[PDB]
Amino acid sequence: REIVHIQAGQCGNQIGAKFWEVISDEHGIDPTGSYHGDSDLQLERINVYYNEATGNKYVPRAILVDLEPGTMDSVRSGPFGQIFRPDNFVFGQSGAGNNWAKGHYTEGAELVDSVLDVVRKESESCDCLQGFQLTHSLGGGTGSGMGTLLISKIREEYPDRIMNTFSVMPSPKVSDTVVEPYNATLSVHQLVENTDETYCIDNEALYDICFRTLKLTTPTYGDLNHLVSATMSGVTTCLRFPGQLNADLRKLAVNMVPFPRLHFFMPGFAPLTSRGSQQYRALTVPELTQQMFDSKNMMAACDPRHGRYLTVAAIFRGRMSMKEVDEQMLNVQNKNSSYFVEWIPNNVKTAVCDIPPRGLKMSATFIGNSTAIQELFKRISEQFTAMFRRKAFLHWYTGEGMDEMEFTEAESNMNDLVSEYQQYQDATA
């Protein structure tokens, strides 16, 4: 049951490379693709993300895409850069100039066919393809515009497969590129319609965690992506290790997505405590549980206590008592009862995986489908409107052949997503 991974653009390639590094370490796969680990858990579902080659080598089922060569040259020289299949690198020369229209309709469209060629060569040797995961940013041009283009073309060729994204949302705390709201709004318009599940990885939240919680006074992309890759590791543990719950993309979607458009998840990670506070606060199951339901541990900048949960998946990792996990999960639900909609019974599911992330005895990862995600969409919506009402920078998009109406429609779709979250928040049994 194979997944095919695509990473597009700088952000997409940067966090995708880290994902492959982290999960390769967890599965005992070295930079040459050789297995050199201790435990049979590591190979049992290796085929989900890796093809096996001659020489007992494991090769990521991964496709690397950009409209410029730079980041992919970096990827190839990165740690684990020689593990990817050479033929799986598809790049143009142009760049997209932080312009969604260029990624989606112009330069991206010229390259998308050669990407699809490689997607199909990977898909066709799968025993039973589950679907696709895409990593990209929404705020630039290629991950945003070409990524959402790829999604729609893949969905045409594989309409009954699951489409999952890890989508990095822009924040003025990390990038000052003024057109980011335009590109994110246009991209969300696509995601709403064409993905089954999207992890909202919000740069605002990654910045706040690094700065406020971990006390990094000048967060780098490296610091942000360390959190992202930890989160990505957590939210894919159920796909990659033997287990009962959410063991495949479609089972995850059936448990997490009650209405097709409401498929935007708030991810979380515990623990997130400074080295300095660690001298005082012990790392325990109650601590993880309390932290994973706290807004400061969320990787989208939304306070769940400002909305209600439709569905939650809680994954614990490491050696710990199942009994204690069950008790804490019951306790945290009882203490937060009001924030779980009554009309979906038993809407929080819990798994435990024996293998902890590197450098921790235990962790927890949270995946919430909360109506408070509306706060991320409203933030983007307000930055979008402040520009669009003065028609700022529109010429960059209309000169690629777009008209105003496509912008009005994308805004409208996103405002309707917000309203739909509100409706389910306000609905009673």
């Binding site: 089972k251 448990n255 009309w343 019974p345 599911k349």
Partner: protein, 439 residues
């Protein structure tokens, strides 16, 4: 009088593994299928031949088919301890499961393997000289356990007519469930199979979980712990078919008493004793003790309160060192002391069977080995409480159409939901009507 077992989806398969392992130990059948005590090579008409065929090389082969829409649970049967007991062809897998979606098990994925499953069951039926019926094991909650089972039972009614079909059905609990949509799947499959099933024994995972925690002192029961207890209950029920003896009363005869109207076909099983080795030591549990325990609600396989409904039948299936005299004295004690009200249109006597073969336990298990055990099967109106709990969960979600798009996307319609739910409301009402007094 052969019985063919069909194990569907994860729960069905894993409970099947535990049941066949126990049956092998009860009968002296080794993991290669050899049975030295059987002196007729290549066949016979012994009581254990209801459940096992024989090859000329002396292998005793379960009359069983295991089917799952993905391979990883059945692959553990294929490579594990009892791998040689089964022909490859009795273990059948697809590649992609039903993703907790009844619609996928019944239609989208199910329809691709159904013909092959029916073809394998036919090869079993063809070796039988007097097939009596099927036993079908499955979850309510999974997409395969729910929707593939429904499909199979409809197809079996077509291919074998009115041949009896019994179910062992695993009713969901939150402590071990894996899908939010289990209530949907439960009501969809219950509605679909209701006219195709002659008798169904529901097993509430939460009652089993609680018995494991409370009586076996297991802190956090696994499926392996649940399944070992479940197999003891299943074995109690099928023992009448697999062993002989003058006081052994066949399951079909109990069923005559258990099923007053075709729809009212869900007995409540209660089993005793469930005790740990540490507690069983220096402690003999008498016939009176185990019988008393069958009227304790905490020992029931489905959480409900029989003291607040009415009985339409009570059957006691004993195993081991039990004589009628002790049974009669225990029943008489219980009649004077317990909350046992029958509907006015049914006789109030208990029906008793005794199989002398002592109960057995699997090595490395949790249950003490005991000299005598009992499974009570009662038909009480209280079992409808279990349908009421599931119906309410269905209603909360369905009023908002939560998750319904996953089913509609696989070709289902809203009408199928409301039809299923209406059938359940009618069944709840059937249970109310049979317990009202005659005018």
């Amino acid at each position: 009088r052969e019985c063919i077992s069909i194990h569907v989806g994860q729960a069905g398969v894993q409970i099947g593994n535990a049941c066949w392992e126990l049956y092998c130990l009860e009968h002296g059948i080794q993991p290669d299928g050899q049975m030295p005590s059987d002196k007729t090579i290549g066949g016979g008409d012994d009581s254990f031949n209801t459940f096992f065929s024989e090859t000329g090389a002396g292998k005793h082969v379960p009359r069983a088919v295991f089917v799952d829409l993905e391979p990883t649970v059945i692959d553990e049967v294929r490579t594990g301890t009892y791998r040689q007991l089964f022909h490859p062809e009795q273990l059948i897998t697809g590649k992609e499961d039903a993703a907790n979606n009844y619609a996928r098990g019944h239609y989208t994925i199910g329809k691709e393997i159904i013909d092959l499953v029916l073809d394998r069951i036919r090869k079993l039926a063809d070796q039988c000289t007097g097939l009596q019926g099927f036993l079908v094991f499955h979850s309510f909650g999974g997409g395969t356990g729910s929707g593939f089972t429904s499909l199979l039972m409809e197809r079996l009614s077509v291919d074998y007519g009115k041949k009896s079909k019994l179910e062992f059905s695993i009713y969901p609990a939150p402590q071990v469930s894996t899908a939010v949509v289990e209530p949907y799947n439960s009501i969809l499959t219950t509605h679909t199979t209701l006219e195709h099933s002659d008798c169904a024994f529901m097993v509430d995972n939460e009652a089993i979980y609680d018995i494991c925690r409370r009586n076996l002192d297991i802190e956090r029961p696994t499926y392996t712990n649940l399944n070992r207890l479940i197999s003891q209950i299943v074995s109690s029920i099928t023992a009448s078919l697999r062993f002989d003896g003058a006081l052994n009363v066949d399951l079909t005869e109990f069923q005559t008493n258990l099923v007053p109207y075709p729809r009212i076909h869900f007995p409540l099983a209660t089993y005793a004793p469930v005790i740990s080795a540490e507690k069983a030591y220096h402690e003999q549990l008498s016939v009176a003790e185990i019988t008393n325990a069958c009227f304790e609600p905490a020992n029931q396989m489905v959480k409900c309160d029989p003291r607040h409904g009415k009985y339409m039948a009570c059957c006691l299936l004993y195993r081991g060192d039990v004589v009628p005299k002790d049974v009669n004295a225990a029943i008489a004690t219980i009649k004077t002391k317990r909350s046992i009200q029958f509907v006015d249109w049914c006789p109030t006597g208990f029906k008793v069977g005794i199989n002398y073969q002592p109960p057995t336990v699997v090595p490395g298990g949790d249950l003490a080995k005991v000299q005598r055990a009992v499974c009570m099967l009662s038909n009480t109106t209280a079992i409808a409480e279990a349908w009421a709990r599931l119906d309410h969960k269905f209603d909360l979600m369905y009023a908002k159409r939560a998750f319904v798009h996953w089913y509609v996307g696989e070709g289902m319609e809203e009408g199928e939901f409301s039809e299923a739910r209406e059938d359940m409301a009618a069944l709840e009402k059937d249970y109310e009507e049979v317990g009202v007094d005659s005018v």
